[PDB]
């Protein structure tokens, strides 16, 4: 995977509404800033039950957004990452509809999971209670198979029916997705919710050996087609560390909340410790299209004796801090407060999570870019966006607070903001200084500060992060300084916003 900053975006929420438009925005407003792009599900349809993650036809681009040719055109200037929704599909798919009509007579009957498919001999309370869940309630919903009420397995919305990834039909379906991406100039594949992909009676059905098998098999298929695979997994940090050595890339989901913690408390020890044990074959982010994950650094939910990267007490303080910095906005969109598939992810833009503090935000992005791994910036964060309360009120979908619709006009207006200009420059810097393609090293000043250093062929850079320099949402004091040497001398920025770094 190219070691350049990537943009995560919905094709229709950045620009006029199409892939062509999004492409234009990237090439004319972010040239040299984002050399890669993760286009969120743009298949048929993109506006269903779960914003693209409930595809009726995964291999067909929603004609309202564009075509596969638009993707090919885009590939000429940007490396493309696309999702491979391996765990489920829309109940409105031809396959599932055939099952509703014909039931066991349908050739697609084996393709979908039901309670009996996993528990042919029935189940005890323990069997079902032991299934891992991102929120309270069992993963089943009612559907009629040829007039017979069946309990279909659904990990997320009731409209997203889980497929048997180990069935012939399920596997054929997944491979057709891989073939389509490989023939459409896609460079990377994101395996959505792969941790849920395998079910086995008596297990948690989440990140078990049977899951590792599925992941391993999908990677093989990926290598066969020259595609790199990034797997998405929100879980106890230990599972992320362990699975990392078996795949090309994993997300670094611990950094986002660890940085909010550091920026709000001044404590960097947790960041230093994570730096020392984290998987370095990762894709870094601060914000994503979902809410901010916190169980990603907390104790194991299935066994509280297994502690996280910080005490559970610090996680609760972290969460309450976001609620305070957003004046209740995040509280109104998080968990049971609105429609959500996950109970603990905190719904709020990262910028709002920090109380819209520019120095803290630019600093967080700086640390993100300095830790090993390919960095990604969510489009709302790319424009330092605030919580979209109007959209939340309209849809009641918790995560929409962080899924604002950016018109071309809004983009140009926001591009004038000092903090957005600073991020554009920081991203450009991270793409042009060859030090980031060299050796990494760091030193820590006893829970007070941490310095990240990269040494490359013709340059080197050192970022010093010291949160205690500017605590408070109203803080205007920089909490990050940068020193670097390039082909044109020895430089230094004591304020990434007033003095954005630029490569000679």
Ligand X SMILES: OC[C@H]1O[C@@](CO)(O[C@H]2O[C@H](CO)[C@@H](O)[C@H](O)[C@H]2O)[C@@H](O)[C@@H]1O
Binding site for ligand X (CB under 6 A): 50, 53, 134, 156, 192-193, 232, 234, 289-291, 341-342, 345
Helix (H, G, I), strand (E, B) or coil at 189: strand
Q: Does 266 bind a copy of itself (CB under 8 A)?
A: no
Q: Does 76 bind a copy of itself (CB under 8 A)?
A: no
Residue 116: CB minimum distance to ligand X, A: 24
Looking only at residues 307 through 346 of this chain, which bind a copy of itself when binding is defined by CB under 8 A? Answer: 338
Nearer to a copy of itself, 125 or 457 (CB): 125
Neighbours of 492 (CB within 10 A): 12
Residue 125: CB minimum distance to a copy of itself, A: 4
Which alpha helices (DSSP H) does 10-118 contain, by range?
Answer: 19-29, 68-75, 94-102, 115-118
Pairing of strands 228-231, 148-153: unpaired
User: Which of 75, 141, 167, 444 touches a copy of itself by CB under 8 A?
Assistant: 141
Alpha-carbon Rg for the chain, nearest whole angstrom, is 22
Which alpha helices (DSSP H) does 165-254 contain, by range?
Answer: 168-182, 209-224, 237-244
- CA 324 to chain centroid: 24
Structure tokens belonging to residue 377: 């910036």
Interface with a copy of itself (CB under 8 A), residue total 26
User: Which of 115, 182, 389, 415 touches a copy of itself by CB under 8 A?
Assistant: 115
User: Which of 103, 110, 130, 456 touches a copy of itself by CB under 8 A?
Assistant: 130
Q: Please provide the size of the chain in residues.
A: 504
CB under 8 Å to 134, separation ≥6 — which residues?
A: 234, 341, 342, 343, 344
Q: Mark 221-247 as b/e (b = at least 16 C-beta within 10 Å).
A: bbeeeebbbbbbbbbbbebbeebbeeb
CB under 8 Å to 33, separation ≥6 — which residues?
A: 5, 424, 427, 428, 431
Segment near a copy of itself (CB under 8 A); pick from 144-152, 170-178, 316-324, 428-436: 144-152
CA distances from 284 to 72, 288, 417, 471, 490 (A): 26, 10, 24, 24, 28
Residue 38: CB minimum distance to a copy of itself, A: 30
Nearer to ligand X, 400 or 466 (CB): 400
Nearer to ligand X, 193 or 354 (CB): 193
Nearer to a copy of itself, 28 or 124 (CB): 124
Q: Which residues does a chain break follow in the chain (C to N more than 2.5 Å)?
A: none
Residue 298: CB minimum distance to ligand X, A: 14
Q: Does 440 bind a copy of itself (CB under 8 A)?
A: no
- Residue 345 contacts which entry, ligand X, a copy of itself, none (Cβ below 5-8 A, type-dependent): ligand X
Backbone angles phi, psi at 410, to 5 degrees: -65, -40
- Residue 125 contacts which entry, a copy of itself, ligand X, none (Cβ below 5-8 A, type-dependent): a copy of itself
User: Which of 2, 28, 69, 116 touches a copy of itself by CB under 8 A?
Assistant: 116
Closest CA to 112 of 139, 130, 91, 85: 91
Tell me how many degrees the CA angle 251-465-470 measures, rounded to the nearest 5: 115
Q: Does 387 bind a copy of itself (CB under 8 A)?
A: no
Nearer to ligand X, 101 or 302 (CB): 302
Beta bridge pairs of residue 465? 450, 480
Residue 297: CB minimum distance to a copy of itself, A: 22
Neighbours of 443 (CB within 10 A): 12
Nearer to a copy of itself, 100 or 473 (CB): 100
Q: Does 125 bind a copy of itself (CB under 8 A)?
A: yes
Q: Does 487 bind a copy of itself (CB under 8 A)?
A: no
Q: Does 138 bind a copy of itself (CB under 8 A)?
A: yes
Q: What DSSP letter does each residue of 131-156 carry, written as one string?
A: S--SSSS-SEEEEEETTEEEEEE-SS
- Residue 490 contacts which entry, a copy of itself, ligand X, none (Cβ below 5-8 A, type-dependent): none
Nearer to a copy of itself, 34 or 145 (CB): 145
- Residue 133 contacts which entry, a copy of itself, ligand X, none (Cβ below 5-8 A, type-dependent): a copy of itself
Residue 137: CB minimum distance to a copy of itself, A: 6
User: Which of 216, 320, 396, 439 touches a copy of itself by CB under 8 A?
Assistant: 396
Residue 115: CB minimum distance to ligand X, A: 20
Q: Which stretches of the chain bind a copy of itself, using CB under 8 A?
A: 114-116, 119, 122-125, 127-130, 133, 136-138, 140-142, 149-151, 158, 338, 393, 396
């Amino acid at each position: 995977m190219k070691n350049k900053v990537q943009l995560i975006t919905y094709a229709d929420r950045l620009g006029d509404g199409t892939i062509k438009s999004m492409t234009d925005i990237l090439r004319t407003r972010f040239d040299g800033v984002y050399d890669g792009v993760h286009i969120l599900p743009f298949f048929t349809p993109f506006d269903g039950a779960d914003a693209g993650f409930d595809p009726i036809d995964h291999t067909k681009v929603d004609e309202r957004l564009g075509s596969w040719d638009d993707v090919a055109e885009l590939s000429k200037t940007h490396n493309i990452m696309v999702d491979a929704i391996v765990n489920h599909m829309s109940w409105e798919s031809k396959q599932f509809q055939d099952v509703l009509a014909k039931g066991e007579e349908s050739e697609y009957y084996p393709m979908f999971l039901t309670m009996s498919s996993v528990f042919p001999n029935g189940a005890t309370e323990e069997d079902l209670a032991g299934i891992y869940r991102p929120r309270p309630g069992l993963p089943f919903t009612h559907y009629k198979f040829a007039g017979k009420t069946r309990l279909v397995w659904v990990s997320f919305t009731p409209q997203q029916v889980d497929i048997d990834t180990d069935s012939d039909k399920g596997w054929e379906y997944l491979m057709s997705i891989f073939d389509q991406m490989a023939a459409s100039h896609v460079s990377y594949i994101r395996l959505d919710a792969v941790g849920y992909g395998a079910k086995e009676a008596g297990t948690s059905c989440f990140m078990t050996p049977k899951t590792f098998k599925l992941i391993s098999r999908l990677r093989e298929e990926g290598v066969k087609r020259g595609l790199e695979i990034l797997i998405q997994v929100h879980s106890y940090y230990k599972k992320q560390v362990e699975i990392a050595s078996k795949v090309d890339r994993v997300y670094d989901f611990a950094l986002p909340p660890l940085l909010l913690h550091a920026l709000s408390t001044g404590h960097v020890e947790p960041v230093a410790h994570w730096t020392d044990i984290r998987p370095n074959n990762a894709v870094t982010v601060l914000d994503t299209h979902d809410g901010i994950g916190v169980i990603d650094i907390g104790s194991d939910q299935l066994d509280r004796s297994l502690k996280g990267l910080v005490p559970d007490e610090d996680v609760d303080n972290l969460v309450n801090t976001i609620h305070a910095n957003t004046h209740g906005e995040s509280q109104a969109a998080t968990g049971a407060a609105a429609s959500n598939l996950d109970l603990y992810q905190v719904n709020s833009t990262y910028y709002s999570a920090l109380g819209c503090n520019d120095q803290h935000y630019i600093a967080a992005r700086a640390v993100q870019f300095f830790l090993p791994g390919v960095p990604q910036v969510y489009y709302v964060g790319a424009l330092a966006g605030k919580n979209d309360m109007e959209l939340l009120r309209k849809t009641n979908n918790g995560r929409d607070i962080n899924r604002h619709y950016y018109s071309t006009a809004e983009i140009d207006e926001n591009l004038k903001r000092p903090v957005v200009k600073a991020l554009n420059a920081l991203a450009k810097f991270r793409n042009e200084l060859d030090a980031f393609d060299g050796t990494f090293s760091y030193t820590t000043d006893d829970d007070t500060s941490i310095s990240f250093t990269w040494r490359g062929e013709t340059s080197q850079a050192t970022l010093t992060f010291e949160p205690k320099r500017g605590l408070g949402v109203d803080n205007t004091t920089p909490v990050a300084m940068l020193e670097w040497e390039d082909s044109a001398g020895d430089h230094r920025s004591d304020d990434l916003i007033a003095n954005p770094p630029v490569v000679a």
